Amino acid sequence: MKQVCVLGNGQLGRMLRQAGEPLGIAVWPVGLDAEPAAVPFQQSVITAEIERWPETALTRQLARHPAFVNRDVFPIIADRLTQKQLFDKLHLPTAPWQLLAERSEWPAVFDRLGELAIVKRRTGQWRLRANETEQLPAECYGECIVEQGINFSGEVSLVGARGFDGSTVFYPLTHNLHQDGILRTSVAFPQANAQQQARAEEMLSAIMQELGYVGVMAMECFVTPQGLLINELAPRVHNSGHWTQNGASISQFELHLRAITDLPLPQPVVNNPSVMINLIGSDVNYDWLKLPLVHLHWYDKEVRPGRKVGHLNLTDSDTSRLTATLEALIPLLPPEYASGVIWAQSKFG
Amino acid sequence: MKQVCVLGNGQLGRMLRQAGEPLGIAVWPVGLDAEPAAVPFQQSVITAEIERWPETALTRQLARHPAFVNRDVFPIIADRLTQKQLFDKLHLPTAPWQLLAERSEWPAVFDRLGELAIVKRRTGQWRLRANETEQLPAECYGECIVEQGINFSGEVSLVGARGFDGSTVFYPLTHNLHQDGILRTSVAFPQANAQQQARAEEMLSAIMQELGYVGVMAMECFVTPQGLLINELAPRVHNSGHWTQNGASISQFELHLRAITDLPLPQPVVNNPSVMINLIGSDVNYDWLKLPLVHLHWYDKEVRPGRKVGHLNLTDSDTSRLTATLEALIPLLPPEYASGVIWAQSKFG
């Protein structure tokens, strides 16, 4: 019996545990509060569904763990500065940026970055125009970064994994839809554009290798006129990959578990397209289940506005049946969901 | 005329041949490269000065030889795993260990084995602390073993032999000094501690018998607070037994030859203490011969750093004369030899 402890007590941890079980792998999602005595830390591999955590009884001992996988990577990614610098080091396309040091810069920051300057904290964000300069916290100077405002045609993410052996497997690119800064819909086609897929894998491998990363990692990018631009990275299973639960032969959760426990890591097989619909601050509606293609993933979380409470995965070989199902779902969902659905739908047309 | 072929062309083979001659026993040290036509394999007993060898024209035919003595033992000893397991099977004290299987273990490996974990390959070694875990090759997992880090008071070896008849003879324990993983000095007293000597013979006989071993075998141990611990075994004449050339009535070389050719195997007689000083990557200095007690064994090998090129054996009934000689040798030897000499000297005081 293989064992794994997951630092973080959310749906990702729950979903990892769910995938673990049928494989004979025990996964123990742990909260930060928790006492080091409650979890089998001592005899398991340790992973995390969170990028950064506070210091506690637990996390203290964890930084000592001999088998806390990718322990050192988190921080690099946790900090926007270091993350951005990593892309730079590898010569990967990303949006032009620089850390915010002093007001003197302001003038030329607008010169090479243009009209809109996107300010961001290192550890939310501002969209300042030349005159809104004064609107920013003073505290920001040297703790906040600026990025060129990028106009993309679309967004995509590359989900893949790397093993201890340097082996690497990837899923097809997934098309994402964010609304109000929230992932709402993801679509995956079994056969992405081969060139674009190739271009993206190239960048993710360079990254994983450089980092000595073992396990599942997601890379978010913008589709632009001058190729793909790396936007952000996630050192863990990621929402945009949920569709793999029902749409691939090996899910992202399983994949993550296989890699860290040294299990085999062949390339997953995707035969059909999938559509994932994220459930945000909405209540369960068992009516959704009248559609046989629908697969409900309820996180069992107290419902709240803006809170991801579950997701729906749809996959089928029949795109018509697939689109029909989306339509049918419209009315069964709150209105805010309509846009996302049509969007998804818009992909099969 | 008895005949023997020695698989391996080193000093051990040379020394066996030297001992063979006056007894009317022809010994043919053979290299691996060699052609099966060059050696009288067909009409001799075959032995080896090496524990493991590659596949060749020679070694091919040898695995067919009807008189390749202890053919099957080598491999058992060649592999640390199987060796360690043999001690286990016989219930002999040895340092706590386990093969390295997975990172999950790491945590508890440090629990029962302690602070320092000694990693070793099966067929060099690492001394990893809990955090140096990541410093080990990935390849190691399941091809490398871990051993408890043992704190011994001293090191000793038991050299002895077993005949086809199950008869068994041993030399007194020999005190060894290793430096930088290299044997530097060995001291033997005619009368070892009777209990300790008894305890050690008990373990070596159990081993030889179990293995059906015929010939000379050496057993290296650690002297600890909870008795002797078997460290390692050598299925052949061993460096720590060189002193027997001049310090015993029957040398280890002769003994090895007698056993395998079915000659008589009475217990050798040791009347005095002996001191052997190994010549490592040093040049011959005929000045050493101004000391009448010194017996030089030059291997006739191209000199090289770290290479054992010869040894000096000293034996006498007069311990004062013996210690004086050691002192005298200090200056005639490179400085690196000083430590070993004083050590040896330290035993007569």
Side-chain angles (χ1 to χ4, degrees), chain A residues 2 42-44 66-67 164 262, chain B residues 102-104 106-108 130 133-134:
Chain A
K2 328 223 106 195
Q42 344 121 197
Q43 25 91 59
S44 32
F164 284 111
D262 217 1
Chain B
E102 79 197 285
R103 314 136 144 119
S104 207
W106 276 121
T133 280
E134 251 112 24

Side-chain angles (χ1 to χ4, degrees), chain A residues 311-332:
Chain A
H311 63 275
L312 271 19
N313 282 335
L314 300 77
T315 180
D316 181 26
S317 38
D318 196 74
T319 69
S320 346
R321 199 169 39 203
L322 186 51
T323 55
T325 306
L326 291 163
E327 212 121 43
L329 267 175
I330 284 134
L332 320 174

Side-chain angles (χ1 to χ4, degrees), chain A residues 2-3 42-45 64-72 164-165 260-262, chain B residues 101-111 129-134 137-139 141:
Chain A
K2 328 223 106 195
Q3 271 182 136
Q42 344 121 197
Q43 25 91 59
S44 32
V45 163
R64 246 148 236 174
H65 208 271
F68 190 159
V69 193
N70 314 312
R71 213 190 12 221
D72 303 300
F164 284 111
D165 68 346
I260 68 179
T261 55
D262 217 1
Chain B
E102 79 197 285
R103 314 136 144 119
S104 207
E105 283 176 328
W106 276 121
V109 165
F110 284 99
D111 203 31
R129 215 185 305 138
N131 13 0
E132 316 196 25
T133 280
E134 251 112 24
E139 174 202 31
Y141 300 66

Side-chain angles (χ1 to χ4, degrees), chain A residues 8-40 42-316:
Chain A
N9 216 168
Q11 65 260 211
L12 298 180
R14 152 171 177 107
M15 292 189 285
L16 270 173
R17 163 171 55 67
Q18 279 175 13
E21 199 192 329
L23 257 39
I25 297 177
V27 186
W28 302 91
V30 109
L32 295 171
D33 47 285
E35 341 95 290
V39 255
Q42 344 121 197
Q43 25 91 59
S44 32
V45 163
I46 292 160
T47 197
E49 62 152 24
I50 52 192
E51 348 210 326
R52 64 186 216 312
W53 43 91
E55 203 226 10
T56 78
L58 191 41
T59 93
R60 234 172 274 143
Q61 236 115 132
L62 275 33
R64 246 148 236 174
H65 208 271
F68 190 159
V69 193
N70 314 312
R71 213 190 12 221
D72 303 300
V73 173
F74 293 103
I76 287 153
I77 310 269
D79 189 334
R80 249 316 236 188
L81 177 61
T82 44
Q83 177 170 169
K84 271 310 243 158
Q85 296 184 320
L86 169 72
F87 297 161
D88 271 17
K89 162 184 173 147
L90 269 36
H91 293 246
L92 306 162
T94 189
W97 66 287
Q98 80 173 96
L99 151 82
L100 200 56
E102 79 197 285
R103 314 136 144 119
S104 207
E105 283 176 328
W106 276 121
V109 165
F110 284 99
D111 203 31
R112 93 255 235 166
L113 272 12
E115 0 132 50
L116 242 88
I118 297 142
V119 188
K120 310 195 209 182
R121 281 196 312 153
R122 283 182 27 182
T123 31
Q125 81 170 224
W126 298 253
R127 302 169 134 239
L128 283 16
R129 215 185 305 138
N131 13 0
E132 316 196 25
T133 280
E134 251 112 24
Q135 258 194 234
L136 173 90
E139 174 202 31
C140 235
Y141 300 66
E143 211 242 81
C144 304
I145 281 167
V146 189
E147 284 182 89
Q148 165 177 343
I150 272 313
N151 274 302
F152 51 87
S153 59
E155 270 176 307
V156 305
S157 57
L158 180 74
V159 179
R162 191 176 164 269
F164 284 111
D165 68 346
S167 274
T168 229
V169 300
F170 298 103
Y171 288 100
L173 280 166
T174 301
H175 298 275
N176 304 131
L177 171 76
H178 301 80
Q179 277 176 186
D180 311 334
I182 302 195
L183 185 57
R184 311 277 325 190
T185 310
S186 300
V187 172
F189 284 95
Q191 237 74 71
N193 179 285
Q195 300 304 326
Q196 178 184 54
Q197 176 95 29
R199 291 314 68 80
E201 293 202 346
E202 284 166 5
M203 299 190 270
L204 191 45
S205 332
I207 285 163
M208 302 188 285
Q209 187 183 256
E210 160 75 13
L211 247 26
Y213 196 76
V214 175
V216 165
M217 175 166 270
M219 159 183 86
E220 300 193 85
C221 309
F222 297 115
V223 182
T224 83
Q226 72 249 290
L228 283 162
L229 261 38
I230 302 176
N231 164 208
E232 233 206 317
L233 249 27
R236 53 161 174 82
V237 287
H238 177 265
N239 200 163
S240 65
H242 287 0
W243 68 257
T244 60
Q245 279 167 306
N246 309 106
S249 79
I250 307 158
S251 83
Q252 69 174 336
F253 297 104
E254 257 201 77
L255 208 63
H256 190 62
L257 295 170
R258 286 153 80 130
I260 68 179
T261 55
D262 217 1
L263 275 32
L265 220 74
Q267 173 64 67
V269 172
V270 186
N271 283 324
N272 318 307
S274 313
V275 181
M276 182 209 67
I277 284 160
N278 245 6
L279 307 177
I280 290 138
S282 313
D283 281 311
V284 206
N285 178 359
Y286 295 110
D287 271 12
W288 296 324
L289 275 47
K290 8 188 256 181
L291 301 169
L293 290 185
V294 170
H295 299 267
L296 164 71
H297 303 269
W298 192 251
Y299 312 144
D300 234 64
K301 271 155 91 199
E302 185 125 1
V303 178
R304 280 174 235 132
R307 209 171 183 210
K308 327 179 137 163
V309 302
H311 63 275
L312 271 19
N313 282 335
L314 300 77
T315 180
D316 181 26

Side-chain angles (χ1 to χ4, degrees), chain B residues 5-40 42-274:
Chain B
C5 299
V6 175
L7 169 73
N9 216 168
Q11 65 260 211
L12 298 180
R14 152 171 177 107
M15 292 189 285
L16 270 173
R17 163 171 55 67
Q18 279 175 13
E21 199 192 329
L23 257 39
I25 297 177
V27 186
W28 302 91
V30 109
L32 295 171
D33 47 285
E35 341 95 290
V39 255
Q42 344 121 197
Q43 25 91 59
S44 32
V45 163
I46 292 160
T47 197
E49 62 152 24
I50 52 192
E51 348 210 326
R52 64 186 216 312
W53 43 91
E55 203 226 10
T56 78
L58 191 41
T59 93
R60 234 172 274 143
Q61 236 115 132
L62 275 33
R64 246 148 236 174
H65 208 271
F68 190 159
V69 193
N70 314 312
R71 213 190 12 221
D72 303 300
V73 173
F74 293 103
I76 287 153
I77 310 269
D79 189 334
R80 249 316 236 188
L81 177 61
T82 44
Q83 177 170 169
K84 271 310 243 158
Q85 296 184 320
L86 169 72
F87 297 161
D88 271 17
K89 162 184 173 147
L90 269 36
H91 293 246
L92 306 162
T94 189
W97 66 287
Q98 80 173 96
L99 151 82
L100 200 56
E102 79 197 285
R103 314 136 144 119
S104 207
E105 283 176 328
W106 276 121
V109 165
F110 284 99
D111 203 31
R112 93 255 235 166
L113 272 12
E115 0 132 50
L116 242 88
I118 297 142
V119 188
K120 310 195 209 182
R121 281 196 312 153
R122 283 182 27 182
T123 31
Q125 81 170 224
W126 298 253
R127 302 169 134 239
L128 283 16
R129 215 185 305 138
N131 13 0
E132 316 196 25
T133 280
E134 251 112 24
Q135 258 194 234
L136 173 90
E139 174 202 31
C140 235
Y141 300 66
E143 211 242 81
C144 304
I145 281 167
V146 189
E147 284 182 89
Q148 165 177 343
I150 272 313
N151 274 302
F152 51 87
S153 59
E155 270 176 307
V156 305
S157 57
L158 180 74
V159 179
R162 191 176 164 269
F164 284 111
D165 68 346
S167 274
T168 229
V169 300
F170 298 103
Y171 288 100
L173 280 166
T174 301
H175 298 275
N176 304 131
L177 171 76
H178 301 80
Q179 277 176 186
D180 311 334
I182 302 195
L183 185 57
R184 311 277 325 190
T185 310
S186 300
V187 172
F189 284 95
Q191 237 74 71
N193 179 285
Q195 300 304 326
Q196 178 184 54
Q197 176 95 29
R199 291 314 68 80
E201 293 202 346
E202 284 166 5
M203 299 190 270
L204 191 45
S205 332
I207 285 163
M208 302 188 285
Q209 187 183 256
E210 160 75 13
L211 247 26
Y213 196 76
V214 175
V216 165
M217 175 166 270
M219 159 183 86
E220 300 193 85
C221 309
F222 297 115
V223 182
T224 83
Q226 72 249 290
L228 283 162
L229 261 38
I230 302 176
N231 164 208
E232 233 206 317
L233 249 27
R236 53 161 174 82
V237 287
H238 177 265
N239 200 163
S240 65
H242 287 0
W243 68 257
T244 60
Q245 279 167 306
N246 309 106
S249 79
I250 307 158
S251 83
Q252 69 174 336
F253 297 104
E254 257 201 77
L255 208 63
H256 190 62
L257 295 170
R258 286 153 80 130
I260 68 179
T261 55
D262 217 1
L263 275 32
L265 220 74
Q267 173 64 67
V269 172
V270 186
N271 283 324
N272 318 307
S274 313

